[PDB]
Symmetry: T
Subunit: 64 residues, 12 copies
């Protein structure tokens, strides 16, 4: 059985690095992370110092 958690990663650099940010967090706290599906992307502007790219992913992990 796989389960997915819905995470939004952030980066001041790129959409790819923002996806990595979310996956890194998942891998910190979950075993058997196997894939991620991008579900949205955006840019936070008017409450940060530098533009912040955001990539939201369903991160899938194998249960057990």
């Amino acid at each position: 059985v796989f389960k997915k958690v819905l995470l939004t990663g952030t980066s001041e650099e790129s959409f790819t690095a923002a996806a990595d940010d979310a996956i890194d967090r998942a891998e910190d706290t979950l075993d058997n992370v196997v894939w991620a599906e991008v579900v949205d992307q955006g840019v936070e502007i008017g409450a940060v110092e530098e533009r912040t790219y955001q990539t939201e992913v369903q991160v899938a992990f194998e249960l057990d």
Copy 2:
């Protein structure tokens, strides 16, 4: 990193109050709740006494 939990709140009063019901539950058990996105709304009729409005939300919270 933000994470979202997918909650359906309920109310005998309104769709807005049903959204509040879900957010209240999130705030009871989670720190740093920052926003909610409505993903569906409906009304339960034929297994309740009074119509029950339901509002399903992705409730976003900042991790750490």
Copy 3:
């Protein structure tokens, strides 16, 4: 077996009351109405006197 009818209710008050308007109509003419799913919402402006909130619902009823 359930069947759904696609109804748009209206209200000069709120989206919740517009949903009730549709459900009330279904309950007038149908037995065993069991739930409703919101599929769209809108506001009619430039052919009514007061803004009219509209809520479109699939109203589900149990057949037999």
Copy 4:
């Protein structure tokens, strides 16, 4: 010909009042506003004092 502008209204009270907020703004600056279609709803939490309901609408107006 109709044109639509994509506006997010806000309210500390309800999704309906947040929709009104957007429509009111459109009517302030546009002639012949004729309808609005709800495209999203959400709640801003962790950068406001009180929860703020938001309703995003395409507000349609007749050109000329």
Copy 5:
């Protein structure tokens, strides 16, 4: 309040049995599981021995 977890069940037999696989896992670890909504189906081929049917479900459970 209901909460949903996003699970992908697997089966070498059918899409229905793959849905059961996910629900069974939810029922192992959660109380008050009340319904499941199918959100995707697929078949894993080129890293398994026999075709494996997969059914992804939002499994809803009542909180408390």
Copy 6:
């Protein structure tokens, strides 16, 4: 001209049999049923005895 009715069939056995349940009902009451399109699938759990698979279909029939 074709018309469609939106029916949810149920089965304690499978998603395919739940689709048949809806189609059977359509064929009981309608002439010239010609096809069905699956629009959703789900499983009712916590108000039935055995899991009940549900398949919602637009059932198309030729008018006249």
Copy 7:
């Protein structure tokens, strides 16, 4: 209250005429038809003599 019926009109001429075909049928059998929304278009080829354009519409009518 408005209700919608989901009709597929057909024409050997055009998508517009296929939409008219559905609306004409609605107007034959329903009072207070007020609008139609196109939901799909297609072309039937390999079971007709000439290509047949099809336009599927939700036809809305005012109840009462």
Copy 8:
């Protein structure tokens, strides 16, 4: 950079002519119109004399 404006054109003749109606309006008031994407089609019936076909388009234009 391209920008899009969301326009609904109308015609008593066809969906194609309704799309032209919107594009013509864009070209009246905008320079460097480069393409249009159809996003919806419909027919206004019960507040016009003759059926009016409507085609909603995102009309893209190159900025500068």
Copy 9:
């Protein structure tokens, strides 16, 4: 088994004729073309002489 190819037809006349353009091409090179489903429509403006209507279709054909 059916297979679909994703083709965009073009016409200086209409969306219907643009759909025919794609289907004609499919029929030139494929046997047993049986139906087409419209998936998008648009208009190319700023790199053609006359507006060019485009209709994108999944063209289905029976294999063997």
Copy 10:
């Protein structure tokens, strides 16, 4: 690089067997078939003898 072909399989038995029908055809003619994603399901009724279940899949295969 992966490529996908869009195939509709058929079965007089089940949606799962209809998916297998499409995958079997892909495996007959393609090397390195690796997965399939269900994109639609339906039932052909009024031009076949027995109901025919259909499952449309994107069948993915690794290029080279």
Copy 11:
């Protein structure tokens, strides 16, 4: 009240830089730009010299 404008940015480098291109243009001409939501991405090939990455964003700005 927030308003959104629908802009497609371009870059010969990356999808992230194409998003920046659109946001930069918005910030040139608008006050209080607060966020952007990616709605589409693509690559222009056969009318440019080098591949051009394009990222379409709804750029949100606070009115007043």
Copy 12:
């Protein structure tokens, strides 16, 4: 007439480079490649050595 092929490119570097990977493959085997539309993005994790970014594109090419 344009045709599209549905390709998933891969890269250990970025979503942009994964899109290039797919386009490069199309250009190897097809003439008159004119544009690509991103339809999905993801990251393969638990069967590769380094995270592999994937970008799925419809690659459009002009027929003849």
